[PDB]
Design a protein around this ligand. Structure first.
Ligand SMILES: C[C@H](CCC(=O)NCC(=O)O)[C@H]1CC[C@H]2[C@@H]3[C@H](O)C[C@@H]4C[C@H](O)CC[C@]4(C)[C@H]3CC[C@]12C
Ligand SMILES: C[C@H](CCC(=O)NCC(=O)O)[C@H]1CC[C@H]2[C@@H]3[C@H](O)C[C@@H]4C[C@H](O)CC[C@]4(C)[C@H]3CC[C@]12C
Ligand SMILES: [Mg+2]
Lengths: 305, 117, 303, 117
């Protein structure tokens, strides 16, 4: 049976790399052409690639046994022994990290449920600073299932060691480059997105991350190749592969307007034929529909502006 | 009774080759992404190779790149591991594993490969 | 039947998204000691794929909102945020056939929320600020597009007015009762979940919310009728309705073991036949399979 | 062009009744949940009634409960509003609206209802 896509507008979709709505749909040839994104990676056959999870609630999150200690001149230190987010054992394997672990860099503020023996809020949510890396002293080994975070504190918070789900509060010094997965060493990765025919560029699904920035109020963009809804859709459907790519149309259902055609390559990324040098944004209220299977060398109609 | 059964291991010279195969029964084989794992005596079970449900984006542990090829034949419910240019470091029990969803949750019993030097 | 049969996504509950709090599904259970006919407004879908109540498409919308934020310092309270609500994609919120903007919380207590706030303090341009928002169970008026949150502060936080997305940090004094949608007045609602045959009880998909508690206590459970993936599946698929319910089997795929049969009623809730006194939990690693259309009065095998 | 066209309004005595219809063209009607809205002169557009794709779970503004019935016939691409026990406060332009997904994003041009007192 023929591949089909869910009948859902991009503006109603979930981003696959930060847990927020999709706000933007664009191409930008000035950005890195062949990103090494490890989340939002799915084959059209519905095989999950890299660290891609099924649920949007797993994206840029983790789960762990937390061990806490106080250390003078740092504060409260969390050592997180990672587990998969459903609680099933994390075993180093065919990917960089537990499913959904962040695939970008900077200093991530994370939130976990903490329990204290102290008076007041026995149960509260604590913000920790986690350096994603690569950094000389990051010493993060999510591949090995060990990561570290801290929060400044004058004295021990008297936290109880136990199970945590960590979610992202904000990003400081975001860089779209893979974190320190294995304390400097190589790990198994989803390959760089691509390749592209000449004249083809990555279609980007964009969201904006809660950030800390001392000086600049501009929203911080992060892109993914497909919305999370497309990941779950291919995962469940197990469609048959019949060529190297699907020719898609991006159509407004109400007017019938055909905004552009594009190629969803089997490896789970969308190319448009675009010759401009700067960003071109698209309305987020159309629908992607499958037109047919096409070979790798299929030549798309160029998109205007 | 979803089941995987490897065959094709044995004793082979360094620089030699052999092909492991793995037959899926009691499952929809085309819905399982497949992987090869090995456990060398005294080491942790480690990743060797992976392939998607339809036979796409093969991926390899660094130590076997160029020498090992994963492939599948869904019509025959079979996944293959071509092991070439064998080294002593390749001596291990080799397991095929199936991933219907997010995890390798179906495993073969395993088969011994011994590379003599 | 010339019509395409209903199917469900091949996804284990433990890999699904909760429909009423933005977290994984951790639990699957029945518990006859809980309210049998909840007025949940999120996670409400017709098998025909029509979204009911305030149910959004994306899990990223669940228990979140979007607004134009106006900040001020108020004597007796602290920093106050006046949120003029907008739908979470930026389209205009107009009071209509539902209680609130899509995804707006459908429960009570004091919700700790997080928003991006620009400050006029030098060296502190962008930060995240936490506010407390009283949801209810009792003036918020989300139906009218107006809600307020606050933080105890000695003086103005020097915040710049602008667009926000608010996400839930924690719940204090959680009560699974619909909030004050309209200053005490009625609003349109998804109807109460039910009805149930004699001996039938609601299947619950469970998650646990980040909480503030002075008394320690256990994880804070919140249930939904269907995981978010089932909502988007019916929304996209627009299946034809051929009877009042679908008989489902919950089966372990590896072992083939049938764990139970259940009825998914057209209004988007699942019933099991269970007469025990306490809760009964189920493994979260099975798959729901559609067997057939059955009548309202189909009698399930007990568990 | 996705289009909705209302008919059936007019001038009617208090306590009387009429039935509005709305015809869809250029869409798959059975994929749209439908609603009726109205705008009384000097007032905001308000919700009157909603029904699902398949004609399930009708819902009503409190002011019209028991008196108005929404129904549809997908084989005729038509949605209906039966308006009974009419009151002066029911005087308005009545609009048909379709919801493909989350929003009422297609609208009829509207039909006038005048209840005489
Ligand atoms: C105390 C917390 C609940 C509070 C919380 O953080 N809620 C999450 C949210 O609001 O997003 C408990 C309740 C269920 C727990 C999880 C489940 O038990 C499953 C799993 C079990 C593993 O041993 C540890 C991780 C993991 C994934 C647990 C992490 C901590 C959780 C989430
Ligand atoms: C400054 C923030 C981005 C940071 C943020 O809060 N990220 C969300 C997250 O991390 O989950 C901006 C960037 C895009 C903005 C949104 C978009 O402009 C769309 C929309 C526009 C409406 O006028 C107001 C709400 C709404 C929904 C905006 C809320 C604030 C957002 C989310
Ligand atoms: Mg910045």
């Amino acid at each position: 049976r023929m591949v089909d896509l869910p009948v859902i507008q991009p503006r109603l979709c979930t981003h696959a790399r930060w847990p927020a709505p999709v706000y933007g749909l664009l191409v930008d040839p000035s950005l890195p052409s062949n990103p090494q994104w490890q989340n939002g990676r799915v084959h059209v056959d519905g095989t999950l690639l890299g660290t891609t999870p099924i649920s949007g609630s797993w994206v840029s999150c983790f789960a762990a046994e937390a061990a806490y200690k106080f250390q003078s001149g740092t504060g409260e230190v969390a050592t997180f022994t990672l587990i998969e987010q459903d609680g099933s054992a994390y075993v180093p394997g065919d990917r960089a990290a537990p499913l959904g672990y962040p695939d970008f860099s900077g200093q991530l503020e994370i939130e976990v449920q903490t329990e204290t023996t102290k008076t007041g809020d026995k149960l509260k949510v604590t913000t920790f600073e986690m350096i994603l890396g690569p950094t000389t002293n990051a010493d993060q080994a999510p591949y090995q299932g060990r990561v570290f975070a801290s929060v400044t504190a004058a004295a021990s918070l008297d936290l109880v060691d136990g199970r945590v789900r960590a979610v992202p509060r904000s990003i400081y010094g975001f860089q779209d480059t893979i974190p320190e997965y294995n304390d400097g060493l190589l790990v198994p990765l989803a390959p760089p997105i691509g390749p592209f025919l000449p004249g083809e560029v990555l279609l980007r699904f964009r969201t904006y991350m809660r950030q800390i920035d001392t000086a600049d109020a501009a929203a911080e963009a992060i892109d993914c190749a497909l919305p999370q809804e497309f990941v779950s859709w291919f995962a469940s459907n197990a469609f048959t592969v019949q060529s190297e790519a699907l020719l898609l149309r991006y159509r407004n259902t109400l007017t019938g307007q055909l905004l552009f055609e594009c190629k969803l390559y089997n490896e789970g990324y969308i190319a448009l034929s675009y010759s401009g040098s700067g960003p071109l944004t698209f309305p987020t209220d159309g629908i992607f529909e499958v037109v047919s299977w096409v070979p790798r060398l299929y030549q798309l109609a160029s998109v205007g502006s | 009774q979803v089941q995987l059964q490897e065959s094709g291991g044995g004793l082979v010279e360094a620089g030699g080759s052999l092909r492991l195969s793995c037959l899926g029964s009691g499952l929809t084989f085309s819905r399982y992404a497949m992987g090869w794992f090995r456990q060398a005596p005294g080491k942790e079970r480690e990743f060797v190779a992976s392939i998607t449900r339809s036979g796409g984006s093969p991926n390899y542990a660094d130590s076997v790149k160029g020498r090992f090829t994963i492939s599948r034949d869904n019509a025959k419910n079979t996944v293959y591991l071509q092991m070439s240019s064998l080294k002593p470091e390749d001596t291990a029990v080799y397991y095929c594993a199936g991933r219907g969803s997010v995890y390798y949750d179906v495993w073969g019993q395993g088969t011994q490969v011994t590379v003599s030097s």
